[PDB]
Amino acid sequence: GMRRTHYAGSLRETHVGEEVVLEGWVNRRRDLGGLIFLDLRDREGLVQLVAHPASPAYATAERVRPEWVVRAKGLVRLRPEPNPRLATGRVEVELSALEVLAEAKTPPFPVDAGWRGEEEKEASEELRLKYRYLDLRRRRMQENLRLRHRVIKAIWDFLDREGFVQVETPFLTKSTPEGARDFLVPYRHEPGLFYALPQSPQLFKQMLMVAGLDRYFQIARCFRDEDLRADRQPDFTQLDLEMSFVEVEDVLELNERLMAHVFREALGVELPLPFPRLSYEEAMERYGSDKPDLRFGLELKEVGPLFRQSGFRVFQEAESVKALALPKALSRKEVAELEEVAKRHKAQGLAWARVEEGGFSGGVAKFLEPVREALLQATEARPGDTLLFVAGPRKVAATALGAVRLRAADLLGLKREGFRFLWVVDFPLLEWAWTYMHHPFTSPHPEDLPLLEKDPGRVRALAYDLVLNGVEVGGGSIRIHDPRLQARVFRLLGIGEEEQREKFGFFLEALEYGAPPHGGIAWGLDRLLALMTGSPSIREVIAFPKNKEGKDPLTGAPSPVPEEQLRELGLMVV
């Protein structure tokens, strides 16, 4: 068997009196009172080793240095005083033997403080990525990676119990000129031909429903060679799933129970069910976003129809006037910062006013007094608040004041805690010619089918987004299984026969052989884990990620190849 008797970090008072053998890294060394203290570290935590002057390990303990790998033997003792910041804090190991297994260069940054429960100074992320195998020694990074393990295992446990079959889908597949750019892989035996890496398993998982597997899932890697700004990696991980004979309700319900199972098992957090749901229209009206942050209130209110007779022209003529009531009297500085956030979101401006005990004061207060009783019942605003207004087109006014609403939350120092999930449902199928939102296999709402040709902009889709704390962590839809309806959606989009066969030919032919009703979703697993850990970037929950620019400082990729390796592929640099 193994030489070690225990993980170093697993020792407790229950082990006092046992002789242990331990292996790990020297986290720190201190000399006090003629004793040598060594913090010995492995993935379960630190344990204090003590070398006494009479001990055979005494000279060895004096020469070891941080990050050296050692094997220690000794007997577990109570400490005279416990250190409650260590789980092993009640005990130490009186060293009888100490063996050096590997020496170590001084690391470019410290990895020792977190394991003592101390705060860690921020290091250059580029330096952290270049030495990622050392960055991953830190307690924080190992907790992230081990949480990711527990989340995926919980997903397997749940979906296996519910009858889902995990199926692995191809990585070398068909390159299509459809939409986002593919990463290409040259085919050596015939220069000029390429595989593509998959943007998602969408077509394969739908074909698995056509194959009768009923329900599928995969922890899937997706590859999209597009703009890497906004915390995007060249590849990322989805929890991808698909089910047969389901309505929207069936997919949402399954995903709610799965998410609650994951949070209970991997985080010890209880998620109340069911999740709240908002239509896309309700979300835009009340929050100005299709990914609302429900950790605070401050909803937007439509007040347009209050000023239809007011002398204030810019309110009276606007298609929409949105109002927001902040529970604080803001400075002229803060208002202008909010106004700047509004104008940077295409608004014409941000009107404002303070709410006093008898009326209003400041900004547009004069034009608000005639409609005071109605304005206050609509906004539920109390004396001391500050009213913010954005007038303009309905989508612009909502989106602008919604961004004002988010930035306002920071200015007021609102406590934003916990995990607030919600479903956003009833997205529009299209948008102005006409174009779809995600992919063209999303089913129209059955009761909206006749509007497909008459009023396409009002057709709802059977599509849904999963949002957590203002972040889109999942998206999917019920699919079209009728090839006649799919052709009908293509005719509405102006997508001809030759273009369909070039982009989707093999799948459109699959629908002719009896596809069941089906639908599904994919989570952004990296985004979920970053939110679960309070990380500012998904790079903190990926073992070996790229930097923000898409390169890998650890290995040096992407790198040149010898021209003989490229000539063998029949390609050359132009």
Ligand X SMILES: Cn1c(=O)ccn([C@@H]2O[C@H](COS(=O)(=O)NC(=O)[C@@H](N)CC(=O)O)[C@@H](O)[C@H]2O)c1=O
Name the binding residues.
178, 224-226, 233, 438, 472, 479, 524-527
From the list ligand X, a copy of itself, none, pick the one residue 520 interacts with, judged by a Cβ distance below 5 to 8 Å according to partner type. ligand X
From the list a copy of itself, ligand X, none, pick the one residue 230 interacts with, judged by a Cβ distance below 5 to 8 Å according to partner type. none
Residue span binding ligand X (CB under 6 A) among the ranges 165-173, 207-215, 325-333, 521-529: 521-529
Residue 324 as a binder of ligand X (CB under 6 A): the answer is no
HEC sequence for 213-267: CCEEEEEEEEECCCCCCCCCCCEEEEEEEEEECCCHHHHHHHHHHHHHHHHHHHH
Residue 292 as a binder of ligand X (CB under 6 A): the answer is no
From the list a copy of itself, ligand X, none, pick the one residue 103 interacts with, judged by a Cβ distance below 5 to 8 Å according to partner type. a copy of itself
Which residues 6+ apart lie within 8 Å of 173 measured at CB? 195, 196, 197, 198
Residues in contact with ligand X, total (CB under 6 A)?
Answer: 21
Q: How far is the CB of 431 from ligand X (least distance, A)?
A: 13
In the complex with ligand X, the residue whose CB is nearer, 124 or 245, is 245
Tokens matching residue 499: 């273009």
Polymer length in residues for the chain: 574
Judged by CB under 8 A, the residue of 515, 529, 531, 532 near a copy of itself is: 515
From the list a copy of itself, ligand X, none, pick the one residue 186 interacts with, judged by a Cβ distance below 5 to 8 Å according to partner type. a copy of itself
Provide the sign of the torsion angle of the four alpha carbons 434, 439, 441, 444, taken in this order: negative
Which residues 6+ apart lie within 8 Å of 444 measured at CB? 429, 452, 459, 460, 461, 462, 485, 489
Residue 191 as a binder of a copy of itself (CB under 8 A): the answer is yes
DSSP secondary structure letter of residue 444: B
Judged by CB under 6 A, the residue of 110, 444, 470, 524 near ligand X is: 524
Q: Could you give the CA distance from residue 172 to residue 168 in angstroms, rounded to a whole number?
A: 12
Closest CA to 404 of 420, 391, 418: 391
Site string for a copy of itself, 493-512 (x = CB under 8 A): -------------x---x-x
Residue span binding ligand X (CB under 6 A) among the ranges 254-262, 404-412, 426-434, 468-476: 468-476
Judged by CB under 6 A, the residue of 232, 257, 277, 416 near ligand X is: 232
In the complex with ligand X, the residue whose CB is nearer, 115 or 436, is 436
From the list a copy of itself, ligand X, none, pick the one residue 438 interacts with, judged by a Cβ distance below 5 to 8 Å according to partner type. ligand X
Q: Specify whether the CB–CB gap between 342 and 317 falls below 8 A.
A: no
Q: Could you give the CA distance from residue 255 to residue 241 in angstroms, rounded to a whole number?
A: 10
In the complex with ligand X, the residue whose CB is nearer, 376 or 473, is 473
Residue 178 as a binder of ligand X (CB under 6 A): the answer is yes
Using DSSP's 3-state secondary structure scheme, residue 411 falls into: helix
Q: Could you give the CA distance from residue 442 to residue 424 in angstroms, rounded to a whole number?
A: 15
DSSP secondary structure letter of residue 465: E
Residue 456 as a binder of ligand X (CB under 6 A): the answer is no
Judged by CB under 8 A, the residue of 160, 178, 270, 497 near a copy of itself is: 160
Residue 330: is it exposed, middle or buried by C-beta count within 10 angstroms (0-12/13-18/19+)?
Answer: buried
Residue 261 as a binder of a copy of itself (CB under 8 A): the answer is no
